[PDB]
């Protein structure tokens, strides 16, 4: 019962791997063995997935379990559509219907704008970078339109890194115009971390400003940058810690050996990766489910050229996509069913905010109830200003010996000492700077005096 | 040039509106500020008055902190009574 | 029950054109009379002035005999002035 | 099929792609080296071996809105040819005081769309606006503009503006007395002498 | 107005001289006493001037 | 006694609601109050009575 399925990892992908292989031991069974072919490549590179994809698919895998890019993904869309292979991912969901693909990740559209319309977000700014598509840009115009938003959608995808020091600068600075202070970030974790960094160095991260961050990953990244910084952040976690499976599994892999698995001791987990072993689980449990309906779906023959035109699609891949879309099991994604596109359904997405101690969930999102709250949770020197007028306000005869509030003698001077007294806070007596009481400047528009 | 009423009420909310823009979340603080800053960039015919009176009343007692956009809404179409008195 | 502006200028516009529409080829003739109906009917803040001062001096100027619609076409859309005074 | 013309040992391919399949021509053509003309839309980035037959519209369409003063419009779209002049007038927008509408008619289905536009064209009510950009290929254009003049939007006060060098291609007789302004761009004049001998020919 | 001795070959700008005419009065309300065909053809007309 | 609502009282403090009624723009209905007292707090029920 050998069961040959083909995989790509981009290079670079550690964990990924790593959680793959902890997959294959953990849900390998006597029935029978996954026997994976790893082949990496540039996922970004259209021309290297291709040949992979038809190097697995002349190697006569049952299924391929990889990674794609906005670039990629229709090539992988459309081959495994055509030659009726199903591709298993952790890379982000298609918009649209795509058969023959398995989709790992959940949809985040509803979560965040469920999570908009929780904070009561009238208008704010959308930063976002083709990489994941324009899909979720396109549903939060949609919905902008539809709610009466007022939103600001800028690319920070297309500016160099090379140049970029004084972009994001002037970014900021025309952010920083009209007031906008509440920012969405929808981003690659490193694209976002660069933001961050770029937030810290012209101070924005102070108090005022409410960051969105949008991705599973919301505890993979460093948080304890803006941490102390003083403003708020949100976002979105698929993986709960606080599950006796993910805990187990954490324990597990926390005691894994780094040398054999790359980068695999740690506390936590990249929600991509953990996705990964799930879609291992996911594997095993819809080629099981295959063997106990009695189906057998083992290839007579070699599959040829995948390019030999007319291609023609085997018939046992049908059946094989219908048991992976089928398959519902437990993960550290939380429950795991599919619909007949492929899509998640029936997720959680814990719903989180950063405070000083740390991160805490303060909900989660369903797909039906939408947004769900989980439980919830010295003095200063007065400031006083004042003009000279008498007896209001008068300077004493021998004032250059005396220093702060008893330099100034009046009727104002002993009512500010008789409302300090009631209200029972220490006054600082200071003089208004230009010498006037109120007024609006009609060419500046500026108020100045008290 | 030449006054209106009807340019000058249009004026007004659109005004008082993108002024509470920047106040977002204080908003029902600076209803009274970004009244003045209207009135003054779409001009009165009565200073006191204001450019639209009863859209401003209605702003007032309506508005909540990010309510804004309904909130407006529902105003901009309000009488502004009588810009004499 | 505030008048606003806009109503009462669109009021007015309209109650003038739909006079003058009921004489035909005297339209020149009668425009302070539908004028003075259509102040009547929409109501003014001042009663000199009128519902709209401005539209009622360009319809006086520019309306010919028969020239009707495309007079009142033209002055509908005009800065009506100061209401108050 | 291109890896078939590539076989046959050809020198160059002309052809076209879709907002899909254009990353496999690109990567394709810049791996094996082989030189790809097309009149499809250009590709946003630095591509080589891919000569990219059609201009740049995004200039013309922000110029064309600065030159009418347009502080508030709509901005209808698909997402055929890209998201990419929406994402460009939309950082302009931010650039500068625009408040703009984007809406999504590419993915309404053209089976069951009558009462879509409707409900459009009823949130274009809401807000008042007079001025809408269409940015989309003829052919949702034309279907477009039908919806407009069935619920007589096509009268004075409205101002629509195409955006596609194909201005001329499409039929304009119908909004053309409805009386609202409609402005657009063209890259073939038909004026000059070398267009207008290609027409003589052309039409025989 | 008479629109039935109107020849169909040549009748294009006939109607918008017509409805401009009819501009002139400023004349809203507008009774069509014609044959299906000729009613078709009138309406059709409105709506591309849009009337 | 041949009136009714607000047309039944007159006086300054009548006038002076109509403005701030007008100026706040809502309906208002002119009411006495039951017990006949402005406002008091009694020192042992801590009850207020009056308007
Ligand atoms: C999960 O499946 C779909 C998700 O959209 C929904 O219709 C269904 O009610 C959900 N089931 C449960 C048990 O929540």
Redesign the interface.
């Known amino acids: 019962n050998s069961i040959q399925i083909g995989g790509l990892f981009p290079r670079g992908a550690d964990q990924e791997y790593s959680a793959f292989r902890v997959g294959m031991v953990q849900f390998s069974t006597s029935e029978f063995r996954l026997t994976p072919h790893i082949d990496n490549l540039e996922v970004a590179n259209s021309f290297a997935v291709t040949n992979a994809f038809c190097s697995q698919f002349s190697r006569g895998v049952y299924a391929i379990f990889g990674f794609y890019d906005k670039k990629s993904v229709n090539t992988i869309t459309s081959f495994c559509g055509t030659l009726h292979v199903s591709f298993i991912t952790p890379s982000f969901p298609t918009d649209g219907t795509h058969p023959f693909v398995i989709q790992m990740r959940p949809d985040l559209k509803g979560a965040l704008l469920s999570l908009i319309e929780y904070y009561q977000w009238d208008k704010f700014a959308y930063l976002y970078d083709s990489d994941r598509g324009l899909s979720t840009l396109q549903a939060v115009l949609d919905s902008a339109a539809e709610k009466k938003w007022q939103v600001t959608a800028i690319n920070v995808g297309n500016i160099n890194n090379d140049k970029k020091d004084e972009t994001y600068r002037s970014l900021f600075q025309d952010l920083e115009l009209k007031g906008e202070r509440r920012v969405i970030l929808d981003c690659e974790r490193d694209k976002v971390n660069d933001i961050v960094d770029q937030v810290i160095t012209i101070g924005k991260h102070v108090k005022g400003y409410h960051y969105i961050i949008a991705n599973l990953g919301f505890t993979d990244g460093d948080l304890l940058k803006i941490q102390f910084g003083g403003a708020e952040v949100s976002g979105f976690q698929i993986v709960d810690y606080d599950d006796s499976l993910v805990s187990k599994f954490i324990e597990r892999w926390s005691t894994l050996e780094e040398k054999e698995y790359p980068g695999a001791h740690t506390a936590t987990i990249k929600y991509t990766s953990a996705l990964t072993y799930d879609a291992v689980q996911v594997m095993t449990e819809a080629f099981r489910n295959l063997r106990k309906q009695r189906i057998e779906i083992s290839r007579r023959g070699n599959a040829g050229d995948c390019l030999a035109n007319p291609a023609v699609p085997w018939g046992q891949g049908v059946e094989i996509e219908r048991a992976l879309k089928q398959v519902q099991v437990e993960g550290l994604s939380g429950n795991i069913k599919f619909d007949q596109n492929g899509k998640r359904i029936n997720y959680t997405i814990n719903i989180m905010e950063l405070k000083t101690n740390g991160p805490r969930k303060i909900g989660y999102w369903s797909e039906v109830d939408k947004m769900v709250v989980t439980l919830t949770e010295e003095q200063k020197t007065v400031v006083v200003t004042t003009i000279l007028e008498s007896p209001y306000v008068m300077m004493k005869k021998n004032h250059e010996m005396l220093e702060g509030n008893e330099r100034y003698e009046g009727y104002c001077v002993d009512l500010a000492a008789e409302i300090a007294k009631h209200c029972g806070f220490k006054y600082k007596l200071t003089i208004v700077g230009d010498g006037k009481y109120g007024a609006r400047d009609a060419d500046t528009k500026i108020w100045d005096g008290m | 040039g030449?006054?209106?009423?009807?340019?000058?009420?249009?004026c007004c909310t659109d005004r008082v509106n993108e002024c509470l823009?920047?106040?977002?979340?204080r908003e029902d603080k600076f209803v009274s500020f970004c009244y003045?800053?209207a009135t003054?960039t779409c001009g009165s015919?009565?200073e006191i008055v204001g450019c639209c009176?009863?859209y401003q009343?209605?702003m007032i007692?309506v508005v909540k902190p990010?309510?804004?956009?309904?909130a407006h809404?529902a105003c901009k179409t309000?009488?502004?009574?009588?810009?004499?008195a």
Do not use: H, I, T
């Open positions: 030449p006054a209106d009423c009807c340019r000058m009420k249009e823009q920047r106040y977002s979340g003045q800053e003054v015919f009565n009176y009863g009343m209605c007692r990010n309510s804004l956009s309904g809404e309000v009488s502004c009574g009588n810009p004499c």
